[PDB]
Amino acid sequence: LPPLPPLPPLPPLPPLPPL
Amino acid sequence: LPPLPPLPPLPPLP
Amino acid sequence: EERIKYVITVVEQIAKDAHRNGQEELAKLAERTAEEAKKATERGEEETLRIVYVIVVVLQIALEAHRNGQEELAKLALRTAEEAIKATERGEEETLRIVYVIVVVLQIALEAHRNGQEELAKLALRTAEEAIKATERGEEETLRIVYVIVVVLQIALEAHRNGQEELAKLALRTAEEAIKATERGEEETLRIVYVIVVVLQIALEAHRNGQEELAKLALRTAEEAIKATERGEEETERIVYDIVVVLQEALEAHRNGEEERAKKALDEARRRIEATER
């Protein structure tokens, strides 16, 4: 009945691969 | 650079 | 199936709310996004639907940025949505990745504003603007540097929330030398920037994993690297890399439960750091 909750924020970028 | 993560599923309604 | 119904419902709620709030530009973008989402649903185009989810998120950012008085952030969110919609019919396969990075840095700008990190919030807007400019004009190599900038901006946001103020300050400085070099064009500087970000990742993870001594050594590595980024040496990248390789081993040894090897790597990392400072 009420409006749907907003879409969750996008997950953060995965960390840079190890050197 | 790493591939972008797949979108997680939506949480259930409260 | 049911999930794309949820997304279409959300974006249609945004248009109704934007109309009621007098946000006509936002409302019409939501309607076209809803129209595009229904076309892709009938065609079963998964990639277009994935872009739809990202577009709805940045429209949520735009509506919320306006409600917080962040009008410049709102305008950049709308430009992101417009560029994302145009590219769906254009046919760029990289559209999903480019827009995803932009939306993530826009999220950082909004979140940093709520957490009092206005300096970080201002930097996130500039990164988004350069990313938006690159996509609207046709710049390709810039987006690769944008990814590294957004990663180090994430580190600054988390470090501030975790109380790691020294790491947060270094992350703030690292991004500025990346944003300044991105608009200047110095490619050799960006190589050192990438390695510094890896160092900052180690410091953040080591602090969370009971490796404070390792985290402190990582901070010394990054703080010594910035003084040489402003000095301009390629041997700096090799010197920092040799430290990074062994900083990583101590971090990975702790994860695998090998404390004997973790100490060995830790001491060798410390010795390499001391020689450069010497």
Numbering used by the authors:
A (entry chain B): 3 to 21
B (entry chain D): 203 to 216
C (entry chain A): 3 to 280
Publication text:
Reasoning that proline-containing peptides would incur a lower entropic cost upon binding than non-proline-containing peptides, we decided to start our experimental characterization with designs containing at least one proline residue; in most of these designs, the peptide backbone is in or near the polyproline II portion of the Ramachandran map. For the polyproline helix, there are roughly three residues per turn, and, probably because of this, we obtained more designs that target three-residue than two-residue proline-containing repeat units. Crystal structures reveal repeating interactions between protein and peptide interactions as designed, including ladders of hydrogen bonds from protein side chains to peptide backbones. Our results show that by matching superhelical parameters between repeating-protein and repeating-peptide conformations, and incorporating specific hydrogen-bonding and hydrophobic interactions between matched protein and peptide repeats, we can now design modular proteins that bind to extended peptides with high affinity and specificity.
Here, inspired by natural and re-engineered protein–peptide systems, we set out to design proteins made out of repeating units that bind peptides with repeating sequences, with a one-to-one correspondence between the repeat units of the protein and those of the peptide. We use geometric hashing to identify protein backbones and peptide-docking arrangements that are compatible with bidentate hydrogen bonds between the side chains of the protein and the peptide backbone. The proteins are hyperstable and bind to four to six tandem repeats of their tripeptide targets with nanomolar to picomolar affinities in vitro and in living cells.
